[PDB]
Amino acid sequence: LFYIINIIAPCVLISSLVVLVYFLPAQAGGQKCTLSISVLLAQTIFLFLIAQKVPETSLNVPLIGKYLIFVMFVSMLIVMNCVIVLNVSLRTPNTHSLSEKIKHLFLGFLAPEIKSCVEACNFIAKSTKEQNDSGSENENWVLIGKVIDKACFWIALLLFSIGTLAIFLTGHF
């Protein structure tokens, strides 16, 4: 009961915060990396906290230390995946290439004054057209990012729940 109330429960609460990053938007201003790296900093604090409670013999790693390492690593993976989503959503036809594979997977299953005036109107319309094309590509890449958000949300929920329950019901038995 002492370990549950003072170490286990506070640690679990903080660590469960990493699953929130899947409901942040995957574009500039979403601050997936801000959040995730801050959660990782709290996890470091937990590692320091645990160093103060386990026994001083150095022949094995305690079970609780194993578990902390595992959850820290899973959190790190999810920060990596947030960063990858940001990279994917801000892509452009110029820097990268949107393979049709990705598109199927995500967008599928889941007087001289008159002549100069007319020339300038035509040029104005053409420039607007060009700008709109470029933009259209950009919004395609934003929509892919939003699909990836949904999919990764479900993966992360499942993984965290399962992992935690099993590891902390082994100790209770």
Place this chain on the structure above:
Amino acid sequence: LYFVVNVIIPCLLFSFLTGLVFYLPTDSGEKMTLSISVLLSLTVFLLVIVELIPSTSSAVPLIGKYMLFTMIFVISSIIITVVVINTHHRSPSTHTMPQWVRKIFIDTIPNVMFFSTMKRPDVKSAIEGVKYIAEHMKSDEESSNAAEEWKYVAMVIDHILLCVFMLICIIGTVSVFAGRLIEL
């Protein structure tokens, strides 16, 4: 007196701040700034409390109880703030606003928020070009209107949540401590 001043008051202050985050408009992109810095301050204060209170295990102290409620309080706040941000930046291409969301949060709820102040030859080619620019502007304005509707919904959620979270902070605060206060 020693424990009040040295322990309880800082915790009150941090509770207040975390509660304040809900008055910050989403258009100022600093909701995640504020909420994650509050969370880190709370984690540190967990550290503090374990440093300070005794390490007995017979029974949960009053400060233990209060610390747990405070931790849940902060966590809830943070999660709903993320929720609002996510709602506001909701893509119309992949999502469609449910009718009941629009009816409840845009039409009726803002009206019952009385104390608030929130709103309740080549000439033919030239001519064709001009027409194309105008119609493109039309379409951009339509897209922008849908985006602005989403932002409006976020704003009216913030107002309502500001009310609601002041109420929750009060209720919980009174319940946690009144029993023991009267006991003394």
Place this chain on the structure above:
Amino acid sequence: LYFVVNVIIPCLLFSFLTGLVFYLPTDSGEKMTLSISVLLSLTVFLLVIVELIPSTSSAVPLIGKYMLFTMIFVISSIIITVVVINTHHRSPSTHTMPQWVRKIFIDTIPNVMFFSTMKRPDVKSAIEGVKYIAEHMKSDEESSNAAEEWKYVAMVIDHILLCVFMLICIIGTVSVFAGRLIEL
């Protein structure tokens, strides 16, 4: 075994995170956020070393030398990140690209980066106004091209530095640690 899990694993995480900033695009305003936060994490870790390892002054421990290496490593990565963001925002009006810079970083080196996939009455007033609009679009596109050339140079710099930094991370780590580890 006790020292590995208690010391080296956390240090491995931090080292790995360090270089991750260089794959993050500059478009997301968070390259300095991420790298500086990694640096701070390492500086905080120096507490852990100091609180764990023995406090003799006769000589420098193996993990002392390794942590000094890691300090310098991190600080180099962050300096180059700053450099590239500075270069990306350079303005044509003040800064004109030197010829050698263009010859090397825009023409030569991008070719020899095989692994990367980076590319290498009123009628008169109306007519004059139309002409004005069209020339203003001309000008906007020109200033954007210059600025785009600066952005392109920054992006190529980032790619190259990613590759170099991952190699240097690896090399330095192996050399520093294997040699002692085999003795154990």
Place this chain on the structure above:
Amino acid sequence: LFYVINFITPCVLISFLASLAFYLPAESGEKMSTAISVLLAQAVFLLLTSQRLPETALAVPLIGKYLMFIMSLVTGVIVNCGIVLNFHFRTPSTHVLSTRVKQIFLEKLPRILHMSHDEIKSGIDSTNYIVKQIKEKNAYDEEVGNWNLVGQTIDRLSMFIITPVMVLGTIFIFVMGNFN
């Protein structure tokens, strides 16, 4: 050797990182971020050093004097970074660009530092309105570009003025200290 390795070199490096703030452009909105994290690490070093010495008050140790001085210098750099962003973002509607500032920062220093049928009538009226708005925005923008250029030139001049100052201050103090 113990103090040089454990105490002096980490602190010195960390402080040196404060000079990078000046080479980081104002447009990249991360001057404050960078400077405030530097300040936090310096706080931490101060906490570290307080624990290493006795509580006597006969005199401040030499290494303590040097830490005080160098912290204070660094804090001056941070404050100046903030001031520079304040200057860069001033506009005609809120500030006055005096002649002295123009002369200094747009002519002299850039050179010294070697810096590099009524319906149709209403439609004609609407196109003329578009052009009028574009012209207004251009004058507005070129004054805002003046301000931009001022900031850039301040960056360059600040680097060239601050890095040598930090270096000379440090060299002199430390050669004095090597002769002890």
Place this chain on the structure above:
Amino acid sequence: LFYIVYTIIPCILISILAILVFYLPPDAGEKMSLSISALLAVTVFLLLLADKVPETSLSVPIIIRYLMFIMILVAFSVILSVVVLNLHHRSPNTHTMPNWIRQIFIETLPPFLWIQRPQDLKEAVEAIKYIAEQLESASEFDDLKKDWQYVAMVADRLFLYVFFVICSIGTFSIFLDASH
């Protein structure tokens, strides 16, 4: 002397930070960074003081009283920054600007505070007119928004000055009282 250095100097520099946050322009998007990072400093100073004051629970030493006063001042500076940012980011779509705010903060206070600032041709004409209209609509929306943000600006200046006075006077008084 000992106490002056070891406690008062670091405190001072953190108080200067928290004051400086009110000179940062709201457009920078850095007020919350500065202010909350100042709050982190203050809580760090409380940790710093823990291991120097006597462990008895009859009363509170004067140095802890001064730290708590300084902590509360810094908090209030944060708060007011967050208010100013709320004001700056208001728009007609969210808020209706009241008459009293406009009268007090825009008309009256600034002078006192010293601030003082053919079918086809018809078709094409309709398209041009629409373009112009869009332009103008955006301008009007921005103008209301800028009135909000101007109100924010003038409140921020006023807080700057007030906090500077308040911090200087209180710090001085406390310190002389302690060193007598």
